[PDB]
Amino acid sequence: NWTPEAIRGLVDQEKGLLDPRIYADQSLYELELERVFGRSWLLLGHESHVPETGDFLATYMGEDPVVMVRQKDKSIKVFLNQCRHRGMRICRSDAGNAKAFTCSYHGWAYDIAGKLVNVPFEKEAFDKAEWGPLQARVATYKGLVFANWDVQAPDLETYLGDARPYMDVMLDRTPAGTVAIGGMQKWVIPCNWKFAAEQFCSDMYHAGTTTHLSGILAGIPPEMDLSQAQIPTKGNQFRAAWGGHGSGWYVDEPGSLLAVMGPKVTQYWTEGPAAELAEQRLGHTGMPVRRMVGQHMTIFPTCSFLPTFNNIRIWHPRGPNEIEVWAFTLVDADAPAEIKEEYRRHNIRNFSAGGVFEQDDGENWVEIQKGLRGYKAKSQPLNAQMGLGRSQTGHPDFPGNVGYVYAEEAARGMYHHWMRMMSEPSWATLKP
């Protein structure tokens, strides 16, 4: 078995070393479902996925099927999509409206709250209030819905901590808040979830180098070539004080935003009444938001978004060697009809399974996972030494542990917290 001492030596944030077995090992993965996914806050979607009473979304927490459902009192509930009788799935569609939920196996009926309210032949053949599906804790953050099984786990706000200001770049720009664009794309990648989560946590490096050369080329005019494409170098990276969360962004490099989102969005982000209302609201953080572009973020373990592009996705783990990508797009509720359309179009073009950027990430992760089947490929540590000891907590513009955009400080913090969650059984030590 994986002893805490053996688990602690899998990650070395001091030397910048990672044991490749963390991406591959079966028994480690099984520890993750318990130690990581069973007590972390996990993204299920947006409040606008479930606007009115009885509205639901069939989604996941780790490998546990769950139902997110809007209540009469305007609150959101999350229960395990499993009948406690013999285990049958209670909610059998992706989304819609429910007056109730009935099991198709033996007819145990549930209200929209997940309360067991009817059992056929109950008098003829025990308390119903004691046998409903397992309830998860529900906490919202500016439109985003998060869930957590563990009652002893810290509240969302504390869990997020100093990473919140970086979420507000995407979420807190308008007083009316964000809304999710209709539809949620789902596809399957044969790779470990930590590859996907780390990339949006710390990895601008891959976009600034070789991965997305053809992605930039696709967003570049036919007469223009990659030699005329300016390499971005200016920017910063953030590692969360607690949580394993991380973010990276470019500073004064609006070429990168243009090559992805086009002129109409680039203008909406940087110039005009809306761009001005944003920096006023985000003034208390002290961040030059109108100057931040190409931003990536991960809220540990599997909530990842691209604040400049409004691209959000959830990584559902499916063993050590497979994930599911569940991705959606946000827009400001009051944003013009032309602007919403531009966010919609460019997100599809760039970040869906067929996306000109997304296609290449899938190719990379798949070939890494395949390699980790080899013995010697797991025998030596992987390099995570970028920006080792170059970041400091006193930046004039950006709060928290901030360094260079091309670094792995956010990465080292992500894996270190992963290590911590896997080796510490009690929140007594784990909590911030």
Binding site: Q185, V188, L213, E363
Partner: protein, 181 residues
Amino acid sequence: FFKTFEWPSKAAGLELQNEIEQFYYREAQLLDHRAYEAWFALLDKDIHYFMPLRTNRMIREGELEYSGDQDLAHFDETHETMYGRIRKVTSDVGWAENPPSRTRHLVSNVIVKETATPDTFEVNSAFILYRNRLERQVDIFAGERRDVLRRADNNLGFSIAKRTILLDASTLLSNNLSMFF
């Protein structure tokens, strides 16, 4: 919002049926042999290349199966954005298709419908797209295409003015959609 294709009661002539079929067989050959600039040439300036999302819905909510024109999609493209994709796939630094995949577009079930405009036809067809890449990766797709084709003076005899791909999937089982439908 799709439903059964409205085939005409009077079936299209044998000449036109063979013309549309040979077109798709030719188009498939270009796609399977990676002739991308030759394939892109078929796309009219006003093309809408569309692949909506598909969801699991109860019979009672069957109207909600496909995503709307203002929802996200797998593909929602114009002539300009389509060329970007042709730039990417022919690129030496486009890793998803370098090395390139080995695809097969098997076409059948071709139903031709004439429209108010002569030489412009609404076409329905079914396909199975078999994709094999790298050492062992196999991705099989099935579905139908709903095209609006125009008579053209090119090498294939027709141009594509519109294309809706209805894919037989909800969650995509492939890691990407690097191929063209």
